[PDB]
Amino acid sequence: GAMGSMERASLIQKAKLAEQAERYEDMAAFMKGAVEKGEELSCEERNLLSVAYKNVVGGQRAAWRVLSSIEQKSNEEGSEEKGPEVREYREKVETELQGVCDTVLGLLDSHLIKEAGDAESRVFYLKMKGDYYRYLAEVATGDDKKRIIDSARSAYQEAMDISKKEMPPTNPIRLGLALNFSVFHYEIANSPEEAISLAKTTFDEAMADLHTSEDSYKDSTLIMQLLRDNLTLWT
């Protein structure tokens, strides 16, 4: 699209500047242009792709939640009717959020996933696919909500199978994938016991592997603390 005329290395360099500037919309557009160059992404470029859209969709999800809450209060007994404006604006933000999710899923399908052969790239993109279907599931209500949930579950499950076969239990991608799949179970699939079992098992198995550098120790234990935090919240 608009990034077709810019060099791939320049799109990557400008994505790093945009992150420094906290310009995450720019960053995602730069990284979308870099992806559309057709070459596979390095580990550092995959992380930039992830950071950019996580921040874009993270703001949209936060706004959607503020508007959905206002809307639900507007639909209670005794609340005065204020017209269609709250539903209209909630729908406006919701449509934008879905558009970003579709953009990400579109990049994964054309053609990041089918070219990823290594475990680290393939699990990373399948986790992303699960995450962004999960963001769609947060706002889904119609006849596709079941199918959206199952697309999230399917992508997470495929990533889990690969990561258990191919990665050590302390690998940050494996840990982050298990954390988010556990959040899927708890928050989306109404399976809080499956969420808790997954989180406890993932934590204990990483704990028994920590003894195998101080730098990687710090990376894994950071994510294990998130599993711990959730377990404390959930039990």
Partner: peptide
């Protein structure tokens, strides 16, 4: 309210 990463 759950944390993701």
């Amino acid at each position: 309210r759950s944390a993701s990463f």
